[PDB]
Every structure is written in structure tokens, then in C-alpha cells.
Design a protein around this ligand. Structure first.
Ligand SMILES: Cc1cc2nc3c(=O)[nH]c(=O)nc-3n(C[C@H](O)[C@H](O)[C@H](O)COP(=O)(O)OP(=O)(O)OC[C@H]3O[C@@H](n4cnc5c(N)ncnc54)[C@H](O)[C@@H]3O)c2cc1C
Ligand SMILES: Cc1cc2nc3c(=O)[nH]c(=O)nc-3n(C[C@H](O)[C@H](O)[C@H](O)COP(=O)(O)OP(=O)(O)OC[C@H]3O[C@@H](n4cnc5c(N)ncnc54)[C@H](O)[C@@H]3O)c2cc1C
Ligand code: NA
Ligand code: NA
Lengths: 481, 481
């Protein structure tokens, strides 16, 4: 067995891992990247890229059926499932190819093929062929799909993101479990593509939305289009000869048996930290067996072992994994010099229609920091997109936007939005939060006409008029003497 | 003839005028609004709203024909012209009604019906019935269509924004004339709705773009969809029995005769300041008889007479007219106490597909700013939307974006974009400009994945690499120690 010494070993050649490698190489030449599976990152392979590709097809198909409002009729929209799948697959391959070329450009001696596990706090074994002794180690192993036990009975008809995009044809029908980002994006897209869909979640959850009014509005809006029970009681999902039989109670509590060609487990993903031999370290774990970590430095309780990307089960977003990589890589490279990452303002997006964006502090974080049981030093500004001019012009007038502000200073804290162009409004808001703008300042910014951003102006005015600050600092337009 | 004294008289009850009234009424009770035409504002009646309404219908129709990229096919797309025109009309009547309700709420004695002209610098006459003795006067009379003499031979078949939206049905064919941006917005929309259209522009102009490369790429792009000659040489447009005969030279310079059902003037608006009896005042005029005015205070050479909105032939955009009304109303209301408006960062949008946005300083204004245009003290960061991932996923991968930055400081100066979602990126960029951001700082902002704003990241990196700041003293991600 070959033994190698490195300053930095990075387990996982995904987004976080490749970011960690580039960062760590600026501090030290002695960095290895280990990869047990296919190169290309989860994002380009079976993540962001194919899912967005699926969505683009779905929205082209769906919007073609919604032109009558405008005075146009479209006859026989027909979904060629083989074509839909082929396009997704070929574009997906193209994206993966770019990552593979980057991986290929790295020094051959810096890449080791195989699955790593810890033997002790400085020794990794990769398969049965190599041992790496590393001064510092970065766990960048991502997440995998995961599902409750009952879903396992769907057998060979159980889909995840790992196999959904490899189908040669679109399915006839899919039962989707998991009411979060992936589950709603994929269920809606499939439903828009002529697939018979129902989406079941259990806890009342809708995407990552925290506000109760928002969750209910979104759930009801989705149900105008396809079946979505955020509080479903599901008995079983059992593979038959040609289908999966799903036994569940509907919204009227009526027991229902219904066959679906497939089930999709868009349930909670699992961080890849359970199969890496952590029990051979003193890494402290929470009551769910997730590694505890410093959220600024990415250090576990073992100060020379870091955890980055989906592996730390936090900020499980692509751009965040990339930032995690920079933090873990720099800190692994420069150790024992340790710095804290200055995180970008939180930005989270769901590519449904209408879209969801969450920006800045979440509602729970705001309640924690700006309120208690009996008093609040924050206010909420709101707008409905139903009566918003441009949204109505486009026939997209559905949605709600909540904006949160410090009640004393007017500092913009965060937001939730379910509505059109939420992805873009999310950026606008996220840049405003990172700059620590106040709502009064943001009201002085440009708002064109007629645009969706004007809905944001409405929500900001709503918040502003609730602030403890003087009436006469409520100028939306500044004049100087 | 009945005579009234006011502190402030406002000529024109559109966007600028209604704004001026509200601002003026904060300072004094004696203010009147004079209106010669229909209430509603130009924006709501025959401007932004119905044009955006036509565009949305156009977009749905066209996108319905573009589904095969994604693997979806249609049998047929059928454009019911009458329903298309009706929805535009009913929706705009809705928007107009809101404006009308506001006007109706204003004190009866604050509103005079008729066209005003100056008898002298403190006296207005409204038609033949009223004279207003006014301490301060705001000219907020908007702009009107203007076109060369040859176009007038199109007689009852000449269209402008004033009558286009009033057609009971979509025309079979329309020739559009002039360099006006409205020509591209409306021409493309008409074309996308099945109307046979040719756009004959002038002098190389393309949607107000200033960069030579951008203009050419945009003209080429548009030409993949509809006939557009930015340098057209046109002989005549003469009304016949059921159409207009257009005689012109095609793109190879050959004299061509073609019938179009209507003709649409897009030849640049005229400010309504030629029929106000301005000869009865000492107001200083430029060589094209536009009143000179202070761009910050909106005062003419006569210090108690202001000019606001499209009337001053500057920043002829809706939200800028609103700010104009605010500046002019405040200054007219509080005269002799005068203040300088602090303008928002420039933002203009052309709602074609792909969209156009210009942000901050124009290219001309940048070239002016630098004493030594040789020594090149600004940089250009560039991106093509052709290889931009999300844009490709959506089948929207056409366009370019230039960002401008000071070479020493990296101060973000302004931008031009032709690309998907330019309206939204335009806002993000305009907020960044108003907050005086550097390109270095903008790169520390959140950029989600996979999104169109990742193209902005590419362009910002391109500018940044070119800066004279210390090469490895601008990190994209900040860490503290
Ligand atoms: C369907 C779907 C859609 C998504 N859409 C979006 C979106 O639109 N926007 C967004 O921001 N995020 C999206 N995400 C989330 C995003 O994909 C993740 O945040 C991101 O890919 C995580 O990056 P990573 O580097 O941590 O993980 P990965 O890219 O998975 O890297 C982990 C790597 O480590 C390897 N590995 C695991 N164990 C070992 C071992 N022990 N030894 C060696 N190698 C190992 C794996 O093979 C893998 O290559 C989506 C995710 C999914 C599943
Ligand atoms: C087709 C079209 C599309 C457009 N789209 C957009 C867009 O998408 N976004 C954008 O920002 N801008 C757009 N614009 C520009 C926008 O409409 C103008 O910037 C805006 O309307 C100017 O408003 P205003 O108050 O200055 O003029 P107006 O709203 O026209 O008000 C002037 C008023 O004065 C009255 N008047 C004139 N003379 C007299 C007189 N002597 N006595 C009494 N009353 C008088 C008129 O009747 C009118 O009511 C568009 C314009 C057009 C034509
Ligand atoms: Na993470
Ligand atoms: Na103006």
C-alpha cells in the first residue's frame, strides 16, 4: 500500500472540494484531491443543471397552453418525452465536460481515485490501495438523496435526482415525496410536461418558506395547478408489476389507493459523513450524528479537520458550497493561521412558478434576535402581486412579498417572496442586505415603470411607515440646498 | 373672462403634473392643475401600459412557436386579433381608471379644463374662458408624436401611439419608420403577433445603444426574426385605397415598392412647448427652441417658471417624470426657497427580446469625463450571453453586456446590456451605481447558481482584471483575522 504525505487532503472533488483545492494551493503545493465517484460535481451532473433544464422545457410547454388570456389559441401541445430527455441529457453532458476539463488540468499527482475513510485524525485510507497522511483534512463529500423506510418498498420504481435525469422517456405518472426545493421544482416541472403528479409532504412545509401565511398562500397557489398536500398522511408506497401502489388519505381524509409509474424521493438529503469512519476520530457530533462545526471557520472539534459544502448540512446551495470551499481551503492551507469567512448575505431560490426567494435573516432568526414573547424591534412590509400592474400585464399576478426591517433604525433584515422574477428581486434584496441598507435608503433607489420591482417599492413603503423614526426622514427623493 | 390667483399653476395633468401638484400642495393651498385633453396620463392611456400589454401578448404568441428546442411541438397557433386588441384596451382602461379616480379626488377648484398659454410671465389664459394669475408656473405638458412630412402622405393610415392601441383588430402589415425605440418595441411585438412588418430606421440607431459593436449585434439579432434596416433610405409613403404604398431601397440598395395596411411613425417625439405662447415671456430657448433649464432645479431662465417631465425633453422616462414633478412642485411650492434634486442613477429599458438596458453614465458621458481619452483611464468588462449557462438552458443565449469602470479606483461608472432579463439586471446595476460601488466590491456580492446575473459576474471580472489596483489585493470573498 502506497503512503503519501500532504499538508492538505480534500475528500470530495465537487464544488466545495475543487474550490478548497484552488484556495489551499495558494498557501501550499502539497494538496491532494480524492474522488470516489464520477467527476463533474453533483450540480452539473444530477443537480442544478439538469433540474433547471427540465424546468425550462416544462415552462415552455406550460406557457404554450396559457396564451388564451392574451387572445391567442394554441392547438395540440404534444410533449415528445424522448426529445425532452435527450435535450436535458446532452446539455447536461456539455456542462459536466467543462468541469472535467478543469479537473483534467490539475496536476496528476494532486488527484487520487477512490473512496476515502479516516483511520485516525491524520490518516485516510483510499480504497485498499493508498494511505494519505495529512496535516490538515477537508471533508467536502456533499450530500446524497435519502428517504424514510416506507419509500424503500417502491423498489426499482423509486427515483431520485441520481436517476430521474437518465430516463430515456418521460414517465406517465410520478408520486413525489418531499415538499422542499427539489420536490416542488421537479413535481411542478413534470406536471407541466404532461406527467400525472401528486406531491406529498408531511410537516406543513412549503419549500423553505417560514412565514405561515406565505406557506399557506403558496400551497394554495400550487394547488390551482397540480395536487400538493403539505400535510399528507401516507400509508404505503409498494412496488407492483407495472406501477407503485400508493395508499394515502386525501385532503378530505378519504382513504385512497392510486398507482403511479414511479415515486420520486425528494425527501431530506443526507450529508455524506456517515460512511467515512468518523468514529476513528474525536470529532464531536450532534444528537443526529452530524459533525459540529464552527460556521465561520468550518473547523470541526478537531481543529485541523474542516467540513465544507453540503457535507456540513448547512447553506446547502451551490454558491455557498463554493464559498465553503474558499473558507475551508484557505484555512486548511494557512493552518494554524485561522480566519473567519465573511459570508455573503443569505440568498435562497426555488425555481417554481411563481418562484420563491429568501434573503438575509430568516423569520426565525429575526424573531430570535429582534423580538421576544412580549415585544418586537422589527416590522414587516408587505405587498400582494395579484394587484401589481406589470405582473397583471404579463398574467403572472400571483404572489406575496414580506420585507423585514429593524423598527428603530430601519435597517433591512431579510425577506420572503413567492412571486414572478423572485430570483432577480432576490439578488436586488441580497445586495441591499450585504451593504446594510435601510428601507428608507432603498426607497431612494431607482424603480422603473412598469416593472415587478415596483411591488418591492410597495412592500418597502409599508415597512417604512411602521418605523419608530421621524415622519420627516421619510423622503423617497432627496433634495439638497 | 373669469380670473384666479394661485401661488402655483401647473400646465398639464399627466405624471409630472400630478406629481408637481402633490409636492406643491405640501407648501401652499393655492395651486391649480390645467388639462386640455383626457385625464389618465400619457403613460396609462397610450404609453407604457398598453405598449407593455401588446408586448406580453406578443411574447406569449412567439414563445408558443419556439417550443421544439425543448422537445415540445404544437399543431397550430392561432392569433385572434380582435381579442388581442380588446384585452390591451380593457386592461389599459383599468389603469387609466385608477389615475382618473385620483384626479377626481382632487379639490374641484384646483382643476381647470382647457389648454393654457402664456400671456406674460405671471399670466396664463385657458382657452377663452379663464385667466390665471400665478406667482410660480410649472410647464408639465409632455411630448407628442412627431414625424417628417413624407409620412403625412399616409393620411388616415398613419399610426402613432395615439391611435395604434385603438385598432379593433391587428393589422395585416405595418411599415415602421424612424430611429425611435418605440419602433423596435412595437415593431417586434406586431411581428410576433403575425403582422407582416418591416422596420425602417435611420442613421445606424438601435434601441438607444451607444457602443458600435452592441448596435451591430442587436441589429443582426433582430434581423433573425424581422426585417430591420437601421440605415434605411425611404422615398415615400402615400395613402392608397386600402393600404399605404411604401417606396424604399432594400438592404442591397434596390428600389422596392411594397403595400402595407398601415404605417407607424417612430421618428422621435416633440416636447409640447411650441404652442404655449412662450414668445410672451423672456424664457431663453436653444437653437431648436427647447427652453433652457437648470437640470437640478428645473428652473428656466425665468426663475419662477419650471419645466418638468417630457416637456423639458430630458430623461424622457416615466419614473424620471415622477421625480421631475417632485422637484418642480417642491420648488414652485416653496419659492423663493429653491432646492437641487439629487437624481437617481440613470436607468432606461427597451422591452424588446432580447431586452436593452442602459445604466449610469452613458458611454458618451464617460468619454467626456476623461480629459485624456488617449491615456485610457476607464476599463470595459464584457460578457457574451451566447455561452452563458442559464441563458443557454432557457434557449435565451443571445446578447452582450459591457460594464464601465474607472481604471484607478474601479468605480463602477455605467453599463449597456442587450440580453435576457436586462430590465432586472438593469435595476441591480443602477442600485450599485447610486451606492457608488466599485467593481471589486460588486464581486463580493451574492451571485446565485444557475442565473443570468452570473454573466454580470463574468463581465465584472473582465473589468477587474484590467484595473490598476493591486492584483492580489482584491479577493472576491473576504476573511477576517
Ligand atoms: C436536484 C438538485 C437541484 C439543485 N438545484 C440547485 C440550484 O438550483 N441552486 C443551488 O444553489 N443549489 C442547487 N442544488 C444544491 C447543490 O447541488 C449543492 O449545494 C452542491 O452541489 C453541493 O456541492 P458539494 O461540493 O458540497 O457536493 P458534490 O458536488 O456532491 O461533491 C461531493 C463529491 O464528493 C464525492 N465523495 C463522497 N464521498 C466520498 C468519499 N468518501 N471519498 C471520495 N469522494 C467522495 C462525491 O463523489 C462528489 O463528487 C441542487 C441539488 C439537487 C440535488
Ligand atoms: C408608446 C410609448 C411607450 C412608452 N413606454 C415607456 C416605458 O415602458 N417606460 C418608461 O419609463 N417610459 C415609457 N414611455 C415614456 C413615458 O410615457 C413618458 O416619459 C411620460 O408619459 C411623460 O409624462 P409627462 O407627465 O411628462 O407627460 P404626460 O403624461 O403626457 O402629461 C402631459 C399632460 O399635459 C397635457 N397638456 C399638453 N399641453 C397642454 C396645454 N397647453 N394646456 C393644458 N394641458 C396640456 C396633456 O394632455 C397631458 O395630459 C413611453 C412612451 C410612449 C409614447
Ligand atoms: Na455548507
Ligand atoms: Na424630464
Amino acid at each position: 500500500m502506497k503512503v503519501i504525505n500532504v499538508d492538505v487532503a480534500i475528500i470530495g472533488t465537487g464544488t466545495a472540494g475543487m474550490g478548497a483545492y484552488r484556495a489551499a494551493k495558494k498557501h501550499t503545493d502539497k494538496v491532494v484531491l480524492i474522488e470516489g465517484g464520477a467527476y463533474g460535481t453533483t450540480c452539473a451532473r444530477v443537480g442544478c443543471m439538469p433540474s433547471k433544464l427540465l424546468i425550462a422545457a416544462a415552462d415552455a410547454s406550460y406557457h404554450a397552453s396559457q396564451t388564451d388570456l392574451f387572445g391567442i389559441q394554441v392547438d395540440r401541445i404534444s410533449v415528445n418525452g424522448k426529445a425532452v430527455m435527450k435535450r436535458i441529457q446532452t446539455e447536461r453532458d456539455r456542462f459536466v465536460g467543462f468541469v472535467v476539463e478543469s479537473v483534467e488540468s490539475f496536476d496528476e499527482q494532486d488527484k487520487i481515485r477512490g473512496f476515502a475513510k479516516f483511520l485516525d485524525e491524520h490518516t485516510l485510507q483510499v480504497d485498499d490501495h493508498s494511505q494519505v497522511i495529512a496535516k490538515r483534512i477537508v471533508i467536502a463529500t456533499g450530500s446524497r438523496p435519502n428517504y424514510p423506510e416506507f419509500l424503500a418498498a417502491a423498489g426499482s420504481r423509486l427515483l431520485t435526482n441520481d436517476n430521474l435525469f437518465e430516463l430515456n422517456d418521460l414517465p406517465k405518472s410520478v408520486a413525489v415525496f418531499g415538499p422542499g426545493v427539489i420536490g416542488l421544482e421537479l413535481g411542478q416541472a413534470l406536471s407541466r410536461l404532461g406527467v400525472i403528479v401528486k406531491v406529498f409532504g408531511r410537516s406543513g412545509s412549503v419549500a423553505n418558506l417560514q412565514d405561515e401565511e406565505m406557506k399557506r398562500y403558496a400551497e394554495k397557489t400550487f394547488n390551482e395547478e397540480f395536487y400538493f398536500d403539505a400535510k399528507a398522511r401516507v400509508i404505503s408506497t409498494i412496488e407492483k408489476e407495472d406501477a407503485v401502489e400508493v395508499i394515502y388519505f386525501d385532503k378530505s381524509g378519504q382513504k385512497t389507493t392510486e398507482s403511479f409509474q414511479y415515486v420520486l424521493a425528494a425527501t431530506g438529503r443526507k450529508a455524506n459523513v456517515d460512511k467515512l469512519g468518523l468514529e476513528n476520530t474525536s470529532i464531536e457530533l450532534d444528537k443526529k450524528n452530524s459533525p459540529l462545526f464552527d460556521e465561520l471557520t468550518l473547523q470541526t472539534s478537531v481543529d485541523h479537520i474542516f467540513v465544507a459544502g453540503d457535507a456540513n448540512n448547512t447553506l446547502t446551495l451551490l454558491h455557498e458550497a463554493a464559498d465553503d470551499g474558499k473558507v475551508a481551503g484557505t484555512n486548511a492551507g494557512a493552518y494554524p493561521v485561522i480566519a473567519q469567512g465573511q459570508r455573503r448575505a443569505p440568498l435562497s431560490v426555488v425555481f417554481t412558478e411563481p418562484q420563491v426567494a429568501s434573503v438575509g435573516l430568516s423569520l426565525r432568526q429575526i424573531e430570535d434576535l429582534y423580538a421576544d414573547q412580549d415585544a418586537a424591534n422589527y416590522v414587516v412590509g408587505q405587498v400582494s402581486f395579484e394587484g401589481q400592474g406589470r405582473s397583471r400585464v404579463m398574467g403572472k399576478n400571483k404572489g406575496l412579498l414580506n420585507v423585514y426591517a429593524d423598527r428603530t433604525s430601519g435597517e433591512f433584515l431579510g425577506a420572503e417572496m413567492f412571486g414572478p422574477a423572485a430570483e432577480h428581486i432576490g439578488h436586488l434584496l441580497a445586495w441591499a442586505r450585504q451593504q446594510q441598507m435601510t428601507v428608507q435608503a432603498m426607497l431612494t433607489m431607482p424603480f422603473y415603470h412598469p416593472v415587478i420591482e415596483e411591488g418591492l417599492r410597495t412592500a418597502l413603503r409599508d415597512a417604512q411607515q411602521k418605523l419608530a423614526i421621524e415622519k420627516h426622514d421619510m423622503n423617497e427623493f432627496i433634495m439638497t440646498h
